[PDB]
C-alpha cells in the first residue's frame, strides 16, 4: 500500500547533485566529497522557516514545496528507511538561531512534528560559547567522526541564524578486497604529476557498463555493493588517463545514476582501486546563490517570517562537512587516475554521497 519515496528521493538528490556541480566547478581540480541528500535535507527543513521570495527561490531550486501533503512524512520515512539497517554511517542536521529572537507561536511544535528535530537556540554574542555548542553538536551527532567546523570562525556577535550538515561514511564491502592484494602504485593526477598511493585489488563479478557523454567522453562504470545490499558505491572512471573528469561531472543527475543501474550487467573484472580518506568542508552560500537562492543570505531581503517576526534575520552561515573513508573492509579496470564516486541507497535512488577523487 506504500511505495518508497523515490520521487522525493530523486528530487532531493538531483538538487543536491546540482549543488555539488557548483562546488566542483569552482574547485581547482581538488578533492571534493559531498552529500546531495544532506544539503537537500537541510534546505527542505529551512523551507519551513521561510516565506515570500525567499521560500520561492528555494522551492524553485529544489523542485518541491514542503508545504504539500506528506512531503515531510515522506522525508522522515526516507531518513529512517535510510538509517534503518545502520558506526558505518552517521549524519546530522542542525539549525542554530539566536536565543533572544521571538519565535512565531506554533513553529517549534510544527517543526518537531514534521522532522523529529529541534531548532537550537544559542546566544551568538557569546562568540566562543556559540562556536563550542555548534562544534559539540556536530562531533557528538556524528559519533565523534566530524570533530571541527572551521567555517564557524565566521560566526561573530552579529550572527543570528546558522545551518549545519555533517556526514561520515566508512562502509564495509559485500566482497572485501584481500589484505594481501593491497599494493603501492602510481596514481596520475590531473596536473600531470604522479604520487605513489596504496591500492586495493579484487577479481570478481561486478555490475558494469560503459558510459560516453554527448560530447564523446568515455567512462568505465562499476557498482561496488556494501555489505548491506541497501547501499552501493558507483565508481565512474575515465577509460584512459587523458580523459577529463569534469565532462561527466557537469552532466550528472540522479536520474542518470539510476539508468546506469538499469543497464549494468555482472561481468568478471579485475578492479584495482585506491584506498582513500577524504574530508571536505563547503561553505554553501556561493553554490546556493548560483542556483538562485540569494535572499536567504541578505539581512533585509530575507523572509524568515515563518520562524520569526523580528529582523534583520538571514542565514549568516551555511556549511556542510563530509568525511568519507574507503579501504579493504580477462578485463581490468585500473583506477590510477582521477575518478568520481557516488554512494546510492538502492531502494529509493537517494544519492547519499558524491565526490571527485583528484588525489588519494
Amino acid at each position, epitope marked *: 500500500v506504500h511505495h518508497p519515496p523515490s520521487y522525493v528521493a530523486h528530487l532531493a538528490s538531483d538538487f543536491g547533485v546540482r549543488v555539488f556541480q557548483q562546488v566542483a566547478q569552482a574547485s581547482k581540480d581538488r578533492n571534493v566529497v559531498f552529500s546531495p541528500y544532506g544539503v537537500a535535507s537541510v534546505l527542505a527543513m529551512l523551507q519551513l522557516t521561510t516565506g515570500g521570495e525567499t521560500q520561492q527561490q528555494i522551492q524553485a531550486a529544489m523542485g518541491f514545496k514542503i508545504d504539500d501533503k506528506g512531503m515531510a512524512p515522506a522525508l522522515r520515512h526516507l531518513y529512517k528507511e535510510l538509517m534503518g539497517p545502520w558506526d558505518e554511517i552517521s549524519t546530522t542536521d542542525a539549525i542554530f538561531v539566536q536565543r533572544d529572537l521571538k519565535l512565531v507561536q506554533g513553529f517549534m511544535p510544527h517543526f518537531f512534528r514534521l522532522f523529529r528535530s529541534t531548532v537550537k537556540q544559542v546566544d551568538f554574542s557569546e562568540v566562543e560559547r556559540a562556536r563550542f555548542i555548534i562544534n559539540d553538536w556536530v562531533k557528538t551527532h556524528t559519533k565523534g567522526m566530524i570533530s571541527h567546523l572551521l567555517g564557524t570562525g565566521a560566526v561573530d556577535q552579529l550572527t543570528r541564524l546558522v545551518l549545519v550538515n555533517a556526514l561520515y561514511f566508512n562502509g564495509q564491502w559485500k566482497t572485501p578486497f584481500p589484505d594481501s592484494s593491497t599494493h603501492r602504485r602510481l596514481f596520475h593526477k590531473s596536473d600531470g604529476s604522479t604520487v605513489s598511493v596504496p591500492m586495493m585489488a579484487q577479481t570478481n563479478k561486478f555490475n558494469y557498463t560503459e558510459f*560516453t*557523454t*554527448p560530447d564523446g*567522453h*568515455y567512462y568505465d562504470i562499476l557498482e561496488l555493493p556494501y555489505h548491506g545490499d541497501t547501499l552501493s558505491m558507483f565508481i565512474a572512471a575515465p577509460y584512459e588517463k587523458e580523459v577529463p573528469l569534469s565532462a561527466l561531472t557537469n552532466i550528472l543527475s540522479a536520474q542518470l545514476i539510476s*539508468h546506469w543501474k538499469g*543497464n549494468m550487467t555482472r561481468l568478471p573484472r579485475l578492479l584495482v582501486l585506491p584506498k582513500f580518506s577524504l574530508e571536505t568542508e563547503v561553505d554553501l552560500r556561493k553554490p546556493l546563490e548560483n542556483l538562485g537562492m540569494t535572499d536567504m543570505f541578505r539581512p533585509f531581503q530575507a523572509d524568515f517570517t515563518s520562524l520569526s517576526d523580528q529582523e534583520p534575520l538571514h542565514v549568516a552561515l551555511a556549511l556542510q562537512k563530509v568525511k568519507i573513508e574507503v579501504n579493504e573492509s580477462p578485463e581490468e579496470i585500473i583506477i590510477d587516475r582521477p575518478f568520481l564516486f557516488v554512494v546510492r541507497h538502492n531502494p529509493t535512488g537517494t544519492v547519499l554521497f558524491m565526490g571527485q577523487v583528484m588525489e588519494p
Partner: nanobody, 115 residues
Framework: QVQLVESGGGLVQPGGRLRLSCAAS????????MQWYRQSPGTERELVAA????????DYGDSVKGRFTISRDNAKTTVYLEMNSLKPEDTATYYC?????????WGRGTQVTVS
C-alpha cells in the same frame, strides 16, 4: 569497415517535418556518442544534436532546441534526427558523427532543403 550512412533528407515546405536516420557499422556503436552537425556554403559547420551512449543525455544547438529531437537505438545500430517546425534557415547538409574520444567518425551527409 567503418561506415556511417545518412538518409531521409529532401525538400520540405516551411513548417514541415523530416526524420533523418544514420545507419552505422564496423565499430562498437553502443559505446559511442552520436551527433548531428549541419553545414551550408558560406556558413560554418555547427552542432545540431548530440546523444550519450545510454541514458538519453542530449545536447542541442541553440538554433534547433525545442524543434529537433535526437534519438538512437543501439540494437539497430542507428541514430535518428526528427526535425519539426522547419524553416528556410534550416537548409543545409546534415552530417552524422560518432564519437568516443580520441576517436571520431563521419558520414557522407544528406541534403535538407526547406523552401
Amino acid at each position: 569497415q567503418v561506415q556511417l550512412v545518412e538518409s531521409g533528407g529532401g525538400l520540405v515546405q516551411p513548417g514541415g517535418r523530416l526524420r533523418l536516420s544514420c545507419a552505422a557499422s564496423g565499430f562498437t556503436f553502443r559505446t559511442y556518442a552520436m551527433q548531428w552537425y549541419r553545414q551550408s556554403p558560406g556558413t560554418e559547420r555547427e552542432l545540431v544534436a548530440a546523444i550519450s551512449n545510454i541514458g538519453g543525455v542530449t545536447d542541442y544547438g541553440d538554433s534547433v532546441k525545442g524543434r529537433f529531437t535526437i534519438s538512437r537505438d543501439n540494437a539497430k545500430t542507428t541514430v535518428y534526427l526528427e526535425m519539426n517546425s522547419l524553416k528556410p534557415e534550416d537548409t543545409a547538409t546534415y552530417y552524422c558523427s560518432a564519437v568516443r574520444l580520441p576517436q571520431r567518425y563521419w558520414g557522407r551527409g544528406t541534403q535538407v532543403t526547406v523552401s
